[PDB]
Amino acid sequence: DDFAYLNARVRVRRGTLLKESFFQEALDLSFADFLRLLSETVYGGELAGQGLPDVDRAVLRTQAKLVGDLPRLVTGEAREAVRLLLLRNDLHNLQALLRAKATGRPFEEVLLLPGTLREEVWRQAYEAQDPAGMAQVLAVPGHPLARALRAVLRETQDLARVEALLAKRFFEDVAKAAKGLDQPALRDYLALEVDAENLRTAFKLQGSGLAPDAFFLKGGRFVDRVRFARLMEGDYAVLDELSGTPFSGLSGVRDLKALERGLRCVLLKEAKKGVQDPLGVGLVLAYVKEREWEAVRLRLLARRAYFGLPRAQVEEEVVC
Amino acid sequence: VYNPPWAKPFELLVSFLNTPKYGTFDPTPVVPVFFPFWFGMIVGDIGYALLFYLVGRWLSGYVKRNEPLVIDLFALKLKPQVIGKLVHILNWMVFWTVVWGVIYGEFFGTFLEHLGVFGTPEHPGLIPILIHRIDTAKTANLLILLSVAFGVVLVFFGLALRAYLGLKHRHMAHFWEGVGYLGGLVGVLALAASYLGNLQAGWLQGLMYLGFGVFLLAVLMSRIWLMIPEIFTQAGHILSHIRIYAVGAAGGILAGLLTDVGFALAERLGLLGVLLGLLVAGVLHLLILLLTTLGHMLQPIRLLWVEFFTKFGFYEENGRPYRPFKSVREA
Amino acid sequence: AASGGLDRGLIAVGMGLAVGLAALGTGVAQARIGAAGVGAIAEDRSNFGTALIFLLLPETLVIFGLLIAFILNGRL
Amino acid sequence: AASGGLDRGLIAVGMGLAVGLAALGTGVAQARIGAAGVGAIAEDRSNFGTALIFLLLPETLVIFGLLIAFILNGRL
Amino acid sequence: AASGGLDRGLIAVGMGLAVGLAALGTGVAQARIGAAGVGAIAEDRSNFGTALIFLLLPETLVIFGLLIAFILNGRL
Amino acid sequence: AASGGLDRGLIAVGMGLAVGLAALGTGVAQARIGAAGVGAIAEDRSNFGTALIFLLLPETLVIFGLLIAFILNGRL
Amino acid sequence: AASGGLDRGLIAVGMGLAVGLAALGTGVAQARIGAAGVGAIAEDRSNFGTALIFLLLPETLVIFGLLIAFILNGRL
Amino acid sequence: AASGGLDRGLIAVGMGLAVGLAALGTGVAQARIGAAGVGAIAEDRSNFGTALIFLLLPETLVIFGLLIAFILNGRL
Amino acid sequence: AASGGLDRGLIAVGMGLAVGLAALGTGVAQARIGAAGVGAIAEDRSNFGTALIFLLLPETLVIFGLLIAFILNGRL
Amino acid sequence: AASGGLDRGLIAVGMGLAVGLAALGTGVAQARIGAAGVGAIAEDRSNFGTALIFLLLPETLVIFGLLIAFILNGRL
Amino acid sequence: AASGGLDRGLIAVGMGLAVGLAALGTGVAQARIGAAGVGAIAEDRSNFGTALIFLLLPETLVIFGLLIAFILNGRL
Amino acid sequence: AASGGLDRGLIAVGMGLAVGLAALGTGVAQARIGAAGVGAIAEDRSNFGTALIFLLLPETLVIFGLLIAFILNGRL
Amino acid sequence: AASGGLDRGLIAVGMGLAVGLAALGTGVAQARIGAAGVGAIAEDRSNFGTALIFLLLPETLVIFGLLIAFILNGRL
Amino acid sequence: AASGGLDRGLIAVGMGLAVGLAALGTGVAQARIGAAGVGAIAEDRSNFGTALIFLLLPETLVIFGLLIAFILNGRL
Numbered sequence A: 001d002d003f004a005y006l007n008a009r010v011r012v013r014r015g016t017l018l019k020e021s022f023f024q025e026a027l028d029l030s031f032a033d034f035l036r037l038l039s040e041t042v043y044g045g046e047l048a049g050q051g052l053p054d055v056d057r058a059v060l061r062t063q064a065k066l067v068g069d070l071p072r073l074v075t076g077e078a079r080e081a082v083r084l085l086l087l088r089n090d091l092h093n094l095q096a097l098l099r100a101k102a103t104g105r106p107f108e109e110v111l112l113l114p115g116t117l118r119e120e121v122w123r124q125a126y127e128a129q130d131p132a133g134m135a136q137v138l139a140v141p142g143h144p145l146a147r148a149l150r151a152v153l154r155e156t157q158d159l160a161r162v163e164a165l166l167a168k169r170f171f172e173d174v175a176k177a178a179k180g181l182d183q184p185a186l187r188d189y190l191a192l193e194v195d196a197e198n199l200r201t202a203f204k205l206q207g208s209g210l211a212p213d214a215f216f217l218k219g220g221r222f223v224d225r226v227r228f229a230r231l232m233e234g235d236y237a238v239l240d241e242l243s244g245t246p247f248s249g250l251s252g253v254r255d256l257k258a259l260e261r262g263l264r265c266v267l268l269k270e271a272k273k274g275v276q277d278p279l280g281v282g283l284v285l286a287y288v289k290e291r292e293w294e295a296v297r298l299r300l301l302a303r304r305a306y307f308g309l310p311r312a313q314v315e316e317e318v319v320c
Numbered sequence B: 001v002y003n004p005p006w007a008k009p010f011e012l013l014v015s016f017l018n019t020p021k022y023g024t025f026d027p028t029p030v031v032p033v034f035f036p037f038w039f040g041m042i043v044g045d046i047g048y049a050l051l052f053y054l055v056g057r058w059l060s061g062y063v064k065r066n067e068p069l070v071i072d073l074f075a076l077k078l079k080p081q082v083i084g085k086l087v088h089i090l091n092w093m094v095f096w097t098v099v100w101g102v103i104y105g106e107f108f109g110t111f112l113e114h115l116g117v118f119g120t121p122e123h124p125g126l127i128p129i130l131i132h133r134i135d136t137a138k139t140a141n142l143l144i145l146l147s148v149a150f151g152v153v154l155v156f157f158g159l160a161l162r163a164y165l166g167l168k169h170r171h172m173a174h175f176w177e178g179v180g181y182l183g184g185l186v187g188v189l190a191l192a193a194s195y196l197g198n199l200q201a202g203w204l205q206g207l208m209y210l211g212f213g214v215f216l217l218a219v220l221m222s223r224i225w226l227m228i229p230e231i232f233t234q235a236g237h238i239l240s241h242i243r244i245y246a247v248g249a250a251g252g253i254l255a256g257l258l259t260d261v262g263f264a265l266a267e268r269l270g271l272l273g274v275l276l277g278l279l280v281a282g283v284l285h286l287l288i289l290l291l292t293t294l295g296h297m298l299q300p301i302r303l304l305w306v307e308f309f310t311k312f313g314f315y316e317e318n319g320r321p322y323r324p325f326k327s328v329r330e331a
Numbered sequence C, D, E, F, G, H, I, J, K, L, M, N: 001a002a003s004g005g006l007d008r009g010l011i012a013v014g015m016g017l018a019v020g021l022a023a024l025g026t027g028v029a030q031a032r033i034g035a036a037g038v039g040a041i042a043e044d045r046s047n048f049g050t051a052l053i054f055l056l057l058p059e060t061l062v063i064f065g066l067l068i069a070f071i072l073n074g075r076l
Helices: A004-016 A021-028 A031-039 A052-066 A077-102 A119-127 A131-139 A144-153 A159-179 A184-204 A225-232 A236-241 A256-272 A281-306 B004-017 B030-040 B049-056 B081-086 B088-108 B137-168 B172-180 B182-196 B206-220 B231-257 B279-296 B298-308 C006-043 C048-055 C057-072 D006-043 D048-072 E006-043 E047-055 E057-072 F006-043 F047-055 F057-072 G006-043 G048-055 G057-072 H006-037 H048-054 H057-073 I006-014 I016-043 I047-055 I057-072 J006-036 J038-043 J048-054 J057-073 K006-043 K048-054 K057-072 L006-037 L039-043 L049-055 L057-072 M006-037 M047-055 M057-072 N008-043 N048-073
Strands: none
Touching: A004 A281, A004 C006, A004 I016, A004 K006, A021 A031, A021 A281, A031 A052, A031 A281, A052 A281, A077 A119, A077 A131, A077 A144, A077 A159, A077 A281, A119 A131, A131 A144, A144 A159, A159 A184, A184 A225, A184 A256, A184 A281, A225 A236, A256 A281, B004 B030, B004 B088, B030 B088, B030 B298, B049 B088, B081 B088, B137 B172, B137 B231, B137 B298, B137 L057, B172 B182, B172 B206, B182 B206, B231 B279, B231 B298, B231 L057, B231 M057, B231 N048, B279 B298, B279 J057, B298 N048, C006 C048, C006 C057, C006 D006, C006 I006, C006 I016, C006 I047, C006 I057, C048 D006, C057 D006, C057 D048, C057 I057, D006 D048, D006 E006, D048 E006, D048 E057, E006 E047, E006 E057, E006 F006, E047 F006, E057 F006, E057 F057, F006 F047, F006 F057, F006 G006, F047 G006, F057 G006, F057 G057, G006 G048, G006 G057, G006 H006, G006 J006, G048 H006, G057 H006, G057 H057, H006 H057, H006 J006, H057 J006, H057 J057, I006 I016, I006 K006, I016 I047, I016 I057, I016 K006, I016 K048, I016 K057, I057 K057, J006 J057, J006 L006, J038 J048, J057 L006, J057 L057, K006 K048, K006 K057, K006 M006, K006 M047, K006 M057, K057 M057, L006 L039, L006 L049, L006 L057, L006 N008, L039 L049, L039 N008, L049 N008, L057 N008, L057 N048, M006 M047, M006 M057, M006 N008, M006 N048, M047 M057, M057 N048, N008 N048
16 A cells, blocks of 8 residues: 555645636736736746746646656556656657658757656657657657557558557557556546547547548447447437436537537546545546646636637636 | 687686776676586486486587477577577586586485495485485585585675775775775674584674774774664675575575485385386476576576675676676676 | 462453454554545644544544453452 | 463453454454545535444444453453 | 363354454455445435445354354353 | 363364354455445446345355254254 | 264364365455456446356365365264 | 374364365465456457466466375375 | 463463554554655645644554553562 | 374374465465466467466475475375 | 473563564554655755654664563563 | 374474465565566567566575475484 | 473574564565665665665664574573 | 474474564565566666665575574574
8 A cells, every 4th residue: 555645745735726716807807917816826936927928838837847747756556647647748749749750840840748758858759760769769768658659660650640540559558558557436537538539539530421440449438339430420419329428418519619618527527536535646636637627727818818808708618 | 890618708708807997806707706606506416417418418419309409509599599609608608517517416426325425325226316315404414504605705705805996996985895894704703603613702702702893893984984884784695695505505405305206206106117107207307407497596696796796896787887797797 | 469360361362352453453544544634734724623533433442442451450 | 360260261262352353353444444434525515424424333343242252251 | 160161161262253253354344345435425325325235244244153153052 | 062062162163163264255355346336336227236246256155154054053 | 962072073173274264265366356347247248158157266265175074074 | 094083183184274275375366367357358359268278377276285185084 | 480470471471462463553553644744744844743743643552552561560 | 103193193284284385375476477467468479488488486386395295294 | 490481481472572563563664654755855855854853763662572571581 | 104202293383384484475575576577578578588587586485494494304 | 492491492482583573574664665765776866875774774673683582592 | 303302392393483484574575675676677777786686685584583493403
């Protein structure tokens, strides 16, 4: 056993969190007040001062310290889990890098998030020449993403496919690793995470009109291949088969935006459940998720003030 | 670009002596240091040690009778071929390993044959080494105590080299550390001796202990050293030499005593027919024997590594130029 | 002093088992919750009422043995 | 207490195990379940009585031993 | 009491073992399941009725010893 | 049993362990598997039955023994 | 059997440990697999015949003890 | 054989320990691998030869007990 | 004390379980709660008071045996 | 002999434990490792040789039990 | 001497257990905190003076056994 | 056969335990670490020796058990 | 040591407990702190010293056993 | 050799714990630290010597028990 140490610290970190009324207040504020308001709250303590970019950058940097260095600090299951989150940031970074490399668009042109894998690794990764080499750079830290690339490489070594098939392959990989990781809530969440991803994937790629089979992500349980197929045909009645599911507000939805809105919140309510997680990481995950939802909002509301946008413009999107 | 056995891998280590880093002496020693004991854990018998030649003869002759092997010099393989050509230096040492190893088995069968020495037959109608008796506590005791000695050599060899470390790399810190621990030693020898002789010291040289304990801490104190506590842990190490050697004997000995239940007996009581009803098992025992012996040798080197990578003569150690010892000694 | 019998000797064993097994049990009971509490304190006096009352509960297990031990002993 | 008893030594043995074994079992039972009880502060305000009830339950086991002890006892 | 009462003691020892061994088992059974239990209230308040189904179960094992003592009984 | 012969008390003693140890095993078995149970109702309402019948399985070790205890019951 | 024989009491202990020890091992075994079990069933009733062949294994351990209990006995 | 000595009664006792303890070793071994097992219908139908040998492996422990028992009654 | 009266050793032994078992319990208990505490300290200089105030609780377990020892000892 | 020395019974009790203890250690060694492979093995059919070779070293323990058991056999 | 009392044996026996059992409790207490420590200095260089006092405590559990050792066996 | 008194059985008994406990220890040491070992192979056929190199170290214990057993032997 | 006489055996008993238990207690303490340690080498390269320094504190436990065992010795 | 005086059995029996307890303690000790290393090796080849030595460290603990086992025989 032992999440004790994690748990106490994170609870201390949870102290820096804001009132709901912040997000409400923000609805009507000016930019100067926006700056003041953020600067008085925890991302604000590295706020780069005046201006919208300062906000975005602060949000990133604040998460960089509060989340980004967490996985290292022993290496039990949970520690791996934190590693997975930060690894998603890496995965994007990698994709971007791949594209940069691929598109004849040099080293300079990429900038990346915090993660388990960090600047120097990336710098090497870019600076690795061959697609074989890139995957081998990934072998430097050793990750299911590492594994995913090497596996992806066997057939093909060029960006677009590599990425597509990788993403699919990767999510399959995460799933297995996750079967080996044994928080029941996360196990359920993974299946649902799979499902959510399918719903949105199906949604964006609907009107391709194609088979479910080309990109049916797997581990669905409010979803299966047929539903996927159906939705891809245009069919929102797939969403209307939602009935008693966690995803229940997605019924009556027709558009992707609204779909996403519902999803983000559904996943959020579930994500918030893990609170006083015994092994901490329900709670840590939740703390993270909330920080996101908060973070997103800081930025939204920031734009709203900054550009002098209507209240009604964010009013939709600040509520879960 | 734009004697002979003893010389052969060592000859290649002469060059590796010559790579510098410091005035303290460099990697090389390992290969000539290992050999007698390396071979000398192997202390078998007709069915244990003494058939391992056939395998060596399958590295210079080969096999036919199952699937495939053709020439070990041409090292064709299931997993890197290449290596097999390279490790001819090792092929020599292995052919030698078995040959000498067989021989301390044959030392063993002096004392597990001959009717005056033990109740054992000189050469019977069954097979040598027949109703085994080195197991017997008193006989055994000697073989155990035999193991102890090689461990003593190692205590000296390592700390002496530390005193050389500071001597020739010039660090007083290293010098005093390596030297200083020997200040303790006379008293350590006292404490063992009072039980080893049951008497000698520890109450004789135990008055000398009272002065021996201070001498230690003098130059450990000259470095100042808040880093005193460690000296307990050093006490674990001595005993370790014994234990590792002890097992190298004991597991060895056990192995030879397993040929009783391999080839003199294992169902009924094994005479010359039920004996060969044990031969149903007998062929098997060879392959089982093969498995374990891979295990055995690695304790020595582990043992050696305790000393080496306490930087007692070696500048590979946790990295540092020169490369993993695994790779190093083989030429 | 004393110079008693077998009766005292058996009861001393079970006197020990009752308290010891329970004492250990309370400690384990305490270990999971006790670890759990701590963040709440840093944050909250509002949770101080919880912390103070909550931790207490397992502890009854020890008491049963000790009351039986008080009546038994003095001639144990 | 008092005079010994060879018979008493036999009665005494099975008495202790009931009390002891259960006491250990209750403590472990409480630690994990107890851990669910701190969790309750998170889950609901509605649940708070439950958080207590959950913490409460195991302790009965030791007591089962004590009634069997009551018949065995009186042999002091 | 006295010797030649050792049999009444022998039946007394074996009564205890049934009760103690099971009791330890009951506590462990309770520990994981009680920890689990909180999730049901969230899932449904009706599943609190399920939570009610959750709690009981291991303790029957102890009951088996008393019935067995009973079918025999009182020859002690 | 009687207050008489020791042996019947012994045969009963070693019987008691049979039930007690099997019970101890049942309790651990029940603790992990039972815990798994809170999800099951969620997993399906139909699966609430699967989970419950599944949970049953370790518990068998004791039951054959009561039948057996009865075939014994009289031979002492 | 009244005061049953000297053989009969000794064998009666040593048979019991055979079943009991094996049983404890069975319980731990069942706990891990049972915990594991729950998703597969959820996915398929259909696999259940295979599943019926998979699940089985730990239960044998107790049976061996019973066999030991039968062979010694038959001696009253 | 016969209704025999305490010494013989002791060899009869010990026949059981051999069997109970090894059986427990088999169960724990089976338990971890069994837990992994549940995936397999999902994992790889291909593994049916692998699954068939893997589950088999711990089981060697029990056989050792029967032989030592087999000789014991032949040397009662 | 020495080779003398039968009782004093007999009373002395059973005392020990209380102290030892509970002492073991204190260490484990301290180890989880303590494990939580250090992170609160690590971050927070302010928590050096909170942490100290929490840390204490398990040590009582040890004490129960020792009090039982204070009155008991000297019958020796 | 067949009703030989006092010794034979004393040793005969302990005999089973040798077989058992080793059996238990091997089983645990097997359990974690057997599980550990499982995707990698599934994938590498070639590795049907690799796994087949990998497992062996703890298994040596069982054989040790036979070594002590034979030396025991001949003094029985 | 040439015989040591049953009384001498009793004082002699428990003393080692007192120190050993408690020692395990200290070791585990140290183990979690020490491990926790490894992150804690590394980042918190600031914690190091505090840390240097902070860790120390658990060893006292052994000492109690030792005081109990001081009385027990000088009379042997 | 060869025999003695009560004394030979005592030496024989404690000898086995030395041997048993270490084997048990060997299995546990190897199981966590062994489980840990695997990845290097999985990934790397070239690296394969390191995983093998990991397994050995606890097995030395079994031999220490032999060493102590041997001195007890030969005087048996 | 020595030949016949109960006493050397009584002193010998507690000598063993002292060494075995303590030696074990130190190892467990080393085991968590050591486990954290593998990171330390990274954490700073400097922190390699820190990890080394950490290990010392549990290690005292073994030494304690040796002193009390010594106290039993020296008695001829 | 053969049969002994009163002494031999006590030391010989008791011998097994000295060796067994430390050896077992080392194996578990090894199981966490040993487990910890492997991720580190793969990643950080440089740290490997340290890891290798980590596995060594508990093993001294064992050596002392065997040493105590030798001394007991030495004036015997």
